[PDB]
């Protein structure tokens, strides 16, 4: 089932780049975080100061696809970075918190 999860992940990755290529530039106002593939999920252009969220993916057997992933776009329009390694980091912790 890990072979299938990886395949799902690679399909989503390809689909994410297609989506990011085809959608017009951001139409909103003020600072914002850029659309991005984070490694597991696609995120759209997001206004500064918004905590975006979407369903957990089903790539992994301990992930609950009915839980939510969050990703914080800070008030300068910069995606949250994990303080441990200073790289952009989405919050998947609830995906397998209660397994």
């Amino acid at each position: 089932l890990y072979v299938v999860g990886r395949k799902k992940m690679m399909d989503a990755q390809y689909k994410c780049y297609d989506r990011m290529q085809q959608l017009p530039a951001y139409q909103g106002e003020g600072p914002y975080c850029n659309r991005t593939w984070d490694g597991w999920l696609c995120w759209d252009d997001t206004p500064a100061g918004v905590l975006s969220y979407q369903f957990c993916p089903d790539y992994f057997p301990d992930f609950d696809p009915s839980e939510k992933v969050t990703k914080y776009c800070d008030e300068k329009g910069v995606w949250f970075k994990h303080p441990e390694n200073n790289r952009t980091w989405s919050n998947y912790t609830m995906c397998n918190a209660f397994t």
Partner: peptide, 12 residues
């Protein structure tokens, strides 16, 4: 039951 997926630093 399965191995636990890492969601910490160095993951997406």
């Amino acid at each position: 039951t399965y191995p636990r997926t890492n969601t910490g630093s160095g993951t997406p």
